[PDB]
DNA sequence: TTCAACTGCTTTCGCATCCCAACTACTTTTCCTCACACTTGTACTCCA
């Protein structure tokens, strides 16, 4: 499992719903850092990071 | 019959070598992502 895997399962659930989103948008949305892809370890768990 | 060291005493209460640390390095802990060499047919004609 990798951060490539949490976007892939975010895309399988998108290509189930017949959505006009594509992997162009999933690779655009993280470079603009809208959804928490890069450095998501920092502020989100707050206690599972330390151990 | 004398010189020279050994001698205890001035008050009266209360005041008053071993360890630690610094910063910058290098390294390990592992987990994740793919390639590089091998092989049978098939294809394009090859010589019969």
From Swiss-Prot:
Top-level taxonomic group: Eukaryota
Location of the protein in the cell: Nucleus, Nucleolus
Oligomer and partners: Component of the core factor (CF) complex, which consists of RRN6, RRN7 and RRN11. The CF heterotrimer may further dimerize to form a hexamer. RRN7 interacts with RRN6, RRN11, SPT15 and RRN9.
Notes concerning its domains: Although it shares weak sequence similarity with SUA7/TFIIB, displays a similar subdomain organization as SUA7/TFIIB, with a N-terminal zinc finger, a connecting region (composed of B-reader and B-linker regions), followed by 2 cyclin folds.
Role description: Component of RNA polymerase I core factor complex (CF) that acts as a SUA7/TFIIB-like factor and plays a key role in multiple steps during transcription initiation such as pre-initiation complex (PIC) assembly and postpolymerase recruitment events in polymerase I (Pol I) transcription. Binds rDNA promoters and plays a role in Pol I recruitment. After binding of UAF (upstream activation factor) to an upstream element of the promoter, CF is recruited in a SPT15/TBP-dependent manner to form a pre-initiation complex.
Other observations noted: Present with 398 molecules/cell in log phase SD medium.
The family this protein is said to belong to: Belongs to the RRN7/TAF1B family.
Name the UniProt record assigns to this protein: RNA polymerase I-specific transcription initiation factor RRN7
Species of provenance: Saccharomyces cerevisiae (strain ATCC 204508 / S288c)
Segment of the intact protein contained: 156 to 206 of 514
């Amino acid at each position: 499992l990798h951060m490539t895997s949490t976007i892939s399962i975010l895309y399988l659930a998108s290509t189930h719903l017949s959505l006009p989103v594509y992997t162009c948008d999933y690779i655009k949305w993280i470079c603009t850092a809208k959804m928490p892809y890069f450095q998501a370890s920092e502020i989100l768990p707050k206690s599972w990071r330390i151990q």
